[PDB]
Design a protein around this motif. Structure first.
Motif, short mmCIF file in Angstrom:
data_model
loop_
_atom_site.label_atom_id
_atom_site.label_comp_id
_atom_site.label_asym_id
_atom_site.label_seq_id
_atom_site.Cartn_x
_atom_site.Cartn_y
_atom_site.Cartn_z
N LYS A 5 0.86 -1.17 0.00
CA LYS A 5 0.00 0.00 0.00
C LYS A 5 0.90 1.23 0.00
O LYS A 5 1.84 1.31 0.82
CB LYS A 5 -0.91 0.05 1.22
N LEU A 7 0.97 5.56 -0.15
CA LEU A 7 0.24 6.78 0.11
C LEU A 7 1.11 8.00 -0.22
O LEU A 7 2.34 7.93 -0.16
CB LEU A 7 -0.20 6.88 1.58
N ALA A 98 3.49 -1.00 3.89
CA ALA A 98 2.93 0.30 3.58
C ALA A 98 4.07 1.31 3.46
O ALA A 98 5.06 1.22 4.23
CB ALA A 98 1.92 0.70 4.64
N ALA A 99 3.91 2.28 2.60
CA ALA A 99 4.87 3.35 2.44
C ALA A 99 4.08 4.64 2.28
O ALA A 99 3.12 4.69 1.51
CB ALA A 99 5.83 3.12 1.25
N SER A 107 8.20 7.16 4.88
CA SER A 107 7.98 6.32 6.03
C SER A 107 7.53 4.95 5.52
O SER A 107 6.78 4.89 4.54
CB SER A 107 6.84 6.94 6.90
N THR A 109 6.16 0.94 7.02
CA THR A 109 5.86 0.07 8.14
C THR A 109 5.36 -1.28 7.62
O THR A 109 5.04 -1.41 6.42
CB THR A 109 4.83 0.72 9.13
N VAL A 111 2.49 -4.31 8.65
CA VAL A 111 1.34 -4.72 9.45
C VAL A 111 1.20 -6.20 9.19
O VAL A 111 0.88 -6.62 8.06
CB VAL A 111 0.05 -3.96 9.08
N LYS B 5 -7.52 5.33 11.86
CA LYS B 5 -6.79 4.07 11.81
C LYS B 5 -5.49 4.27 12.59
O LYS B 5 -4.78 5.27 12.35
CB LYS B 5 -6.47 3.65 10.38
N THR B 96 -9.71 9.70 5.99
CA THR B 96 -9.06 8.75 6.89
C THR B 96 -7.95 9.50 7.56
O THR B 96 -7.05 10.05 6.90
CB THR B 96 -8.52 7.52 6.15
N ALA B 98 -4.83 8.61 9.84
CA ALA B 98 -4.05 7.46 10.23
C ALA B 98 -2.91 7.92 11.15
O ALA B 98 -2.34 9.01 10.93
CB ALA B 98 -3.52 6.74 9.00
N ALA B 99 -2.54 7.08 12.08
CA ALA B 99 -1.43 7.35 12.97
C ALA B 99 -0.65 6.06 13.13
O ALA B 99 -1.24 5.00 13.35
CB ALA B 99 -1.88 7.91 14.34
N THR B 108 1.62 10.80 11.42
CA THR B 108 0.21 10.87 11.09
C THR B 108 0.04 11.41 9.69
O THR B 108 0.79 12.27 9.25
CB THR B 108 -0.56 11.70 12.13
N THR B 109 -0.98 10.89 9.00
CA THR B 109 -1.30 11.36 7.67
C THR B 109 -2.81 11.41 7.48
O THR B 109 -3.56 10.85 8.30
CB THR B 109 -0.60 10.50 6.55
N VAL B 111 -5.73 10.68 4.41
CA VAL B 111 -6.05 10.14 3.09
C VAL B 111 -7.45 10.63 2.81
O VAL B 111 -8.42 10.21 3.49
CB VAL B 111 -5.96 8.60 3.04
#
Ligand code: PCQ
Ligand code: PCQ
Lengths: 114, 114, 116, 116
Positions: A5, A7, A98-99, A107, A109, A111, B5, B96, B98-99, B108-109, B111
């Protein structure tokens, strides 16, 4: 078992149409092509592999960030973003990589769930 | 129109059972309670509001990070993570927030899509 | 001309004694060793190169995150964090490559300045 | 005892002339102004407080990100970035609050050291 994913932190959106290449480390320490695709409208890339094929090993996910920024007319720092990890059967079975991209930063991570 | 999220960067997992409080800025500049809940097994909190109720304005999303870390027996830095933004009708309709949490940091971002 | 800074998001501290290897892409498209070192008590690694040696090219900075976490009793997700970039293609610049590490995540950024 | 550092993830540079306001929670649970300033050309803000004045308490560091982006022609998502933390509750420490800014995102971390 594997989803990627991507973003966009500049526009606050999925990063759509980003090329993603997955490699598996071979016995001779070279990277062999494994799976690839382009992120969808949701910024996601599904369907890369199957449980049968996604055996334990070291994998690399390469995200073509430079082309993404250039298509937006924005000058980026990195050639690409690479994520390198070991798939482990003792851990949970599903992996999301995710990026979150900016022109001069990213960033990433994992999941990992059952 | 609003989803929150929360992800855990220490364990590589959703952050489950995290308290989240949403506030709307009032005319007198105080924060009025708007919505709240606890993240699900997926790290997500859905159902906070409706399109009718989620009018333009300044909102604050407060994520109870300190309690999350303490329940894992880990000493954290922050009291909470707060995200403050304007909802805008001219932009896309779904938000959304997200953190991605660590004990001494967070990312945090937003979307924002149609 | 090139500095690497590594921070630990679990402890809120510099990431000390992190091994860092820098490579440069050669004309045959292989990664050639360029320079290496370890982060200091401030989380910084200075002295990797000189402005004369740090010519135009594509560089890879490999930060050995896995070894770092394992030594704290954390079995981390990533093998390493790699940062790949073109440098000095519009003349010399100064580059700081920073990374903020967690067991299952990292952030990285670049601070690029022009010495005049 | 307290330093704030702000970086720009779009330009790969320090975030210069960013306004920063620090508050401390009072006994009546209100946020009292504690100190303020603006980031320098290095993206750093020094000189906010002294070890005598920076007593135990709950502090809020508000970084005025919106004003920063708007001045670059970007209409950003957030009003500001706020960092809330207990400080000095085990005796004096030195705190660096760092933020890495994008128009729709930010990262923040703390580097906490013990002067001995
Ligand atoms: O669904 C997701 C959404 Cl919405 C955001 C992130 C995400 C990923 C990174 Cl690397 C971040 O720094 C942040 Cl703040 C969110 C991840 C997933 Cl899997
Ligand atoms: O000096 C620095 C300090 Cl204190 C922090 C960062 C830094 C680096 C990354 Cl990747 C981050 O996500 C954040 Cl929040 C801060 C960078 C430098 Cl160069």
């Amino acid at each position: 078992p594997l989803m990627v994913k991507v973003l966009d932190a500049v526009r606050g959106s999925p990063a759509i149409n980003v090329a993603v290449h997955v490699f598996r480390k071979a016995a001779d320490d070279t990277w062999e092509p494994f799976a690839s695709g382009k992120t969808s409208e949701s910024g996601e890339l599904h369907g890369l592999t199957t449980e049968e094929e996604f055996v334990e090993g070291i994998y690399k996910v390469e995200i073509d960030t430079k082309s993404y920024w250039k298509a937006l007319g924005i000058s980026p720092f990195h050639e690409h973003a690479e994520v390198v990890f070991t798939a482990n059967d003792s851990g949970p079975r599903r992996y999301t990589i995710a990026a979150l991209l900016s022109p001069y930063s990213y960033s990433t991570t994992a999941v990992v769930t059952n």
